[PDB]
């Protein structure tokens, strides 16, 4: 009695919760870590692939699995009643498991209590904004959502305004935004909330905690909700243990599993009423963009092309 989880997530983030599932259910969980090329591996393994559940990060990566024919549709009242409609595919094709909101890091004492994404292009922020490469998936997803909401013309004008406002070249990573706010290079920047979970939970006497202490989170909205990307999962097209695969996926959205799952990378659980990490809770109420996240995949290439058009990374 077994189930195979193919995951692009390091099993370290999920081993305790998988062990609980196995203990309680009696179903052996086989964890297969696939660092990259998940689609390609499952395709190559063909009709007899051992894969039961496919787990990955980024809505585009998840939709690529579905469009690549390596998933199957499932019916589950458990999953559909837990996962909001905008965060799951039609007829059980894929499901979000956690939310990765892209927020504004803000110098801790700056007078700024709210923000719209569009505000980042205000001329007053010139020389005051940090951001990583505009071509990084975290950013192209946000740009894709902006096209969906506001159109290509408005999105291009935002990109040009933000580029004009950068304090340094769009490069590095998300936590570099916090470093550079601490360093007085910029006052605000776009980066993922979960990194602030990591930094603020780091122990005093680390550089991570020094960066965390330097900043606060303000969650911008579109107007209006905050942009989220996701981690998520789907049942594999040829799952040899389909009943167990559905059991595992249903378990992954249960309250106990969600509590552990989100805490692991300081992400936000998909299931309502799940206890948050204390740092994450301190960010205040989250309003999730009502946009179907599948729209992010729809507009991704257009978004990437706009980023290139404006020479965002120059």
271 is a contact residue toward ligand OXL (CB under 6 A)? no
Contacting residues for 139 by C-beta, under 8 A, at least 6 apart: 131, 132, 133, 190, 307
Bridge partner list, 268: 99
Return the range that interacts with ligand OXL (CB under 6 A); candidates 34-42, 122-130, 171-179, 240-248: 171-179
Rounded to a whole number of angstroms, the minimum distance from the CB of residue 138 to ligand OXL is: 7
238 is a contact residue toward ligand OXL (CB under 6 A)? no
Q: Which is nearer to ligand OXL, 52 or 174 (CB)?
A: 174
174 is a contact residue toward ligand OXL (CB under 6 A)? yes
Report angle CA 108, 109, 113 to the nearest 5 degrees: 85
- The answer to whether 280 touches 137, Cβ cutoff 8 Å, is no
179 is a contact residue toward ligand OXL (CB under 6 A)? no
User: 175 φ, ψ to 5°?
Assistant: -70, -25
Judge whether 194 is annotated as a binding position.
yes
Question: Looking at 173, 221, 286, 313, which residue binds ligand OXL (CB under 6 A)?
Answer: 173
58 is a contact residue toward ligand OXL (CB under 6 A)? no
Assign 165 to helix, strand or coil: helix
Report angle CA 104, 106, 108 to the nearest 5 degrees: 145
175 is a contact residue toward ligand OXL (CB under 6 A)? yes
Rounded to a whole number of angstroms, the minimum distance from the CB of residue 231 to ligand OXL is: 10
* Per-position DSSP letters for 182-199, written without gaps between them: HTTS-SEEEEEHHHHHHH
Chain residues binding ligand OXL by CB under 6 A are 173-175
User: Annotated binding residues for Fe cation, as ranges?
Assistant: 194-195
């Amino acid at each position: 009695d077994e189930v195979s989880l193919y995951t692009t997530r390091e099993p370290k983030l999920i081993q305790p919760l998988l062990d609980a599932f196995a203990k309680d259910s009696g179903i052996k969980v086989n964890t297969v870590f696939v660092k990259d090329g998940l689609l390609e591996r499952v395709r190559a393994e063909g009709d007899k692939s051992p894969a039961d559940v496919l787990m990955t990060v980024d809505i585009g990566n998840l939709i690529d699995l579905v469009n690549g024919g390596v998933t199957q549709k499932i019916q589950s009242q458990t999953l559909d009643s837990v996962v909001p409609a905008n965060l799951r595919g039609a007829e059980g094709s894929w499901y979000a498991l956690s939310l990765r909101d892209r927020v504004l890091y803000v110098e801790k004492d700056l007078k700024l209590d709210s923000f719209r994404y569009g505000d980042l292009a205000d001329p007053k922020w010139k020389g005051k904004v940090c951001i990583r490469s505009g071509q990084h998936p975290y950013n192209t997803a946000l740009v894709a959502a902006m096209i969906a909401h506001d159109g290509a013309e408005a999105t291009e004008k935002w990109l040009r305004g933000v580029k004009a406002n950068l304090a340094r070249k769009a490069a590095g990573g998300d936590r570099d935004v916090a470093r550079d706010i601490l360093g007085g290079i910029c006052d605000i920047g776009l980066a993922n909330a979960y990194y602030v979970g990591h930094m603020k939970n780091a122990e005093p006497g680390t550089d991570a905690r020094k960066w965390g202490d330097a900043i606060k989170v303000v969650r911008p909205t579109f107007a209006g909700g905050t942009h989220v990307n996701i981690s998520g999962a789907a049942v594999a097209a040829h799952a040899p243990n389909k009943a167990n695969a559905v059991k595992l996926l249903e378990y992954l959205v249960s309250e106990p599993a969600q509590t552990l799952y989100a805490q692991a990378n300081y992400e936000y659980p998909v299931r309502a009423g799940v206890k948050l990490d204390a740092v994450v809770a301190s960010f205040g109420p989250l309003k999730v963009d009502t946009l179907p996240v599948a729209e992010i995949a729809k507009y991704r290439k257009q978004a990437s092309e706009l980023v290139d058009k404006v020479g965002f990374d120059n």
